[PDB]
Amino acid sequence: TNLPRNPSMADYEARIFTFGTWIYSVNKEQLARAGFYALGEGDKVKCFHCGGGLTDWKPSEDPWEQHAKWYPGCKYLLEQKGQEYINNIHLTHSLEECLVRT
Amino acid sequence: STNLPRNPSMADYEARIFTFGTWIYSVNKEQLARAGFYALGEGDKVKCFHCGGGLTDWKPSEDPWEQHAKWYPGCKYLLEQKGQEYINNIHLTHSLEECLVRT
Numbered sequence: 051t052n053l054p055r056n057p058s059m060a061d062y063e064a065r066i067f068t069f070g071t072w073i074y075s076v077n078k079e080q081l082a083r084a085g086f087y088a089l090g091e092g093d094k095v096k097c098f099h100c101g102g103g104l105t106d107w108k109p110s111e112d113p114w115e116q117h118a119k120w121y122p123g124c125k126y127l128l129e130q131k132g133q134e135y136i137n138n139i140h141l142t143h144s145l146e147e148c149l150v151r152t
Numbered sequence: 153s154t155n156l157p158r159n160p161s162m163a164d165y166e167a168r169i170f171t172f173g174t175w176i177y178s179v180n181k182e183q184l185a186r187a188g189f190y191a192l193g194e195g196d197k198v199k200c201f202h203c204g205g206g207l208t209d210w211k212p213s214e215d216p217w218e219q220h221a222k223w224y225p226g227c228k229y230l231l232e233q234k235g236q237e238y239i240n241n242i243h244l245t246h247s248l249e250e251c252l253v254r255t
């Protein structure tokens with residue numbers, strides 16, 4: 051089965067704890083709901099389930115959207131957001147990609 | 153902003169299949185009824201009980217739910233039966249196709 055890559059971070063509780071001193075403009079509660087926990091090295095976060103890691107968050111970027119764009123394969127992402135959400139993010143990026151540059 | 157069924161008489165699925173008795177066309181009658189449609193009599197004309205959107209000339213491969221969302225995305229029945237994402241996907245898909253098919 052598609053097993054949780056970090057079982058010790060499966061609980062939301064364990065995840066927000068890592069964001070104790072969060073100086074970055076991306077909301078820590080959003081990140082943790084989206085499966086992420088902080089590493090303690092800048093804004094580096096990682097998904098507890100797929101292990102996908104992300105840094106250098108721009109102030110406006112969305113945790114669930116980023117999760118779906120970079121790591122669409124995540125099972126935690128699938129059972130939380132569903133197929134249509136995931137495919138939606140990718141379609142949108144392709145459309146944008148294609149409209150800009152004509 | 154009231155958004156109530158345009159033909160409240162056709163709200164029950166059972167009322168809608170009943171209209172398909174002599175259905176002789178490519179597209180599945182249960183799939184049509186399920187999507188909110190009922191037959192009018194004339195040809196392969198169907199209308200959604202809720203939005204009043206009407207459709208004819210069904211190709212054999214075409215999906216009731218998809219066509220409903222493509223043509224009449226505003227329907228409340230469609231929304232609460234399939235959800236925002238579904239509806240917005242059909243549209244995004246069509247925009248991407250058209251866009252790509254150019255160069």
Ligand SMILES: CC[C@H](N)C(=O)N[C@@H]1C(=O)N2[C@@H](CC[C@@H]1CN)CC[C@H]2C(=O)NC(c1ccccc1)c1ccccc1
Binds near residue numbers: 095105107108116
């Ligand atoms: C919210 C996403 C942001 N807009 C973005 O695009 N970030 C990128 C990113 O996070 N990564 C891509 C490249 C950098 C990008 C920004 N400069 C590759 C994957 C990720 C990244 O840097 N991930 C790692 C990593 C660091 C060094 C070597 C290999 C992988 C990472 C590891 C652990 C925890 C977090 C991130």
Ligand SMILES: CC[C@H](N)C(=O)N[C@@H]1C(=O)N2[C@@H](CC[C@@H]1CN)CC[C@H]2C(=O)NC(c1ccccc1)c1ccccc1
Binds near residue numbers: 192198207209211
């Ligand atoms: C799954 C639909 C099929 N692939 C399609 O594209 N059908 C179109 C369609 O149903 N309509 C579009 C144009 C014809 C197309 C068929 N060549 C316009 C809207 C719809 C249509 O014919 N709607 C009406 C209608 C309005 C004015 C005059 C004649 C028909 C309609 C009325 C009653 C019952 C069904 C449809």
Ligand SMILES: [Zn+2]
Binds near residue numbers: 126
């Ligand atoms: Zn993940």
Ligand SMILES: [Zn+2]
Binds near residue numbers: 203224227
């Ligand atoms: Zn409708």
